[PDB]
Design a protein around this ligand. Sequence first.
Ligand SMILES: *[C@@H]1O[C@H](CO)[C@@H](O)[C@H](O)[C@H]1NC(C)=O
Length: 386
Amino acid sequence: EAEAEFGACGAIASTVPNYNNAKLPDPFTFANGTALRTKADWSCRRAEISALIQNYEAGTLPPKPPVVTASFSKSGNTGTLAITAGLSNSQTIKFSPTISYPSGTPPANGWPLIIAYEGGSIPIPAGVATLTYSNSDMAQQNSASSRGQGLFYQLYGSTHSASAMTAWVWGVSRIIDALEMTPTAQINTQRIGVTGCARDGKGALMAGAFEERIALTIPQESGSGGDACWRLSKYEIDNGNQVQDAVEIVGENVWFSTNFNNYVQKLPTVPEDHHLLAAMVAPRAMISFENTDYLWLSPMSSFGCMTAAHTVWQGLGIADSHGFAQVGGHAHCAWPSSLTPQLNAFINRFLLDQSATTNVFTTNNQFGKVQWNAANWITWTTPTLT
Ligand SMILES: *[C@@H]1O[C@H](CO)[C@@H](O)[C@H](O)[C@H]1NC(C)=O
């Protein structure tokens, strides 16, 4: 409705005041009760999900500011991309991520690139450039004490509602803006991925969800607030698994907006969960990786959440663009070589243009004191969007 005022997607909802659902919110019904039927409908539903997530847990994601400039220099195989961002009131900030390049002549369209939060914790293949993004400089994340601290808040104000992770997304968007105006950086901006581990894996999922120029999203052991769902983690903690949950996470750090504090004890009233956050990546590609050795990561919750998110890619006819691999037997953020073929399949297909198959959806089912029962959490039947 109201397309004449708001555009093709109408008056998408940012709140659902009467919502109360203990199970996972239905991806395929808009807030107004209209069922999704076409692939085009997904674009609008994703925009509504973005608004809902910003309202309930992420805070406001600002658009591109009026000033974004960049200069580039290189020494050896390391480039420095010096970025300036500024508002209409003259306020500016600056940040200078670095890029590690493969040696020699690049492909005709430039190097594919992975934006790695704090360097990431995945092995990046030799033909892919790595941009090291200091997300912690953009928004600090030491503890609750970090609220409103970081470069983002030196531009927008320390009381701006963006969570630290939303501020990090904004920084990624400025990085891509900078790359698109800097041909001497020799990056194929159509082949950009994002990755991070642990808290930075929560961040990488947010970046891929909200920044549609990211071709491949790779969250690694992101846990609660990442590829786990709030509702499923509450079920886990109530049944004796020592998981991180919504109640604890908002007191531990600043990864979510202060408004989320009003909902952490009332999760059924939140008209989204992280299966919808992950689904915002669709129709682009994502594979996330989890580790069952650490109950803190909420293992069942990640498998259930990603199974629910997967229905969106299934409904869009592109199930193999979304992967999930969950194993045990290795230290947190150590990369197990057993998962390298799955990681490389996604990188090879979606960043390197190879004909790799990407059907990866596996778990060991080692969930501790709970089990995953899909019928207890997923109530919708996946439509074939036209
Ligand atoms: C329901 O909301 C969606 C998203 O704003 C919109 O595309 C759709 O047209 C709405 N339905 C009606 C009947 O207006």
